[PDB]
Amino acid sequence: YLFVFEWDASEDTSIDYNPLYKERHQVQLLGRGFIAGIDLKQQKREQ
RNA sequence: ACUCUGGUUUCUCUUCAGAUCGCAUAAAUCUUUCGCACUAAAGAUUUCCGUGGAGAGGAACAACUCUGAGUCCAAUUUUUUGAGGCCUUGCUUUGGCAAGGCUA
Numbered sequence: 001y002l003f004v005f006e007w008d009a010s011e012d013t014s015i016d017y018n019p020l021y022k023e024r025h026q027v028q029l030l031g032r033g034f035i036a037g038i039d040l041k042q043q044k045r046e047q
Numbered sequence: 048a049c050u051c052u053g054g055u056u057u058c059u060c061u062u063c064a065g066a067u068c069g070c071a072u073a074a075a076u077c078u079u080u081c082g083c084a085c086u087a088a089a090g091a092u093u094u095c096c097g098u099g100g101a102g103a104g105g106a107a108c109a110a111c112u113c114u115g116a117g118u119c120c121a122a123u124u125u126u127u128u129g130a131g132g133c134c135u136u137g138c139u140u141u142g143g144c145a146a147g148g149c150u151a
Binding site for chain 2: 003004007008
């Protein structure tokens with residue numbers, strides 16, 4: 001109301017102190033959908 | 048149910064495309080804005096990767112699939128009947144016509 005080949009940590013976004021946005025509560029999709037590439041047994045463990 | 052067009056594939060040449068021409072994303076020049084410009088935004092122009100529409104030429108085989116075109120009802124409800132004969136009046140184009148009353 002009022003050369004550097006790496007990327008610096010000051011360029012980061014989503015540094016927001018919100019209880020709703022840090023824990024964004026991702027979906028699991030009826031226990032049937034899977035996130036691609038991440039290991040399926042590990043996804044069945046972390047559900 | 049009988050016949051006549053139109054093929055597919057590949058190569059090359061010439062035109063049009065601000066259509067997500069490309070369900071992906073490059074490089075150069077100029078101007079402006081600030082930093083002090085690879086770690087930066089906007090505008091304009093240009094170069095390369097290669098594509099869709101149309102037309103023309105070539106040559107390898109299939110010729111009529113497809114796209115077209117030329118080529119069983121008689122019995123209510125319609126097409127298997129209620130059909131034909133008589134009289135009066137206006138005109139008779141003296142053949143009969145129009146209206147009404149009849150018999151079947």
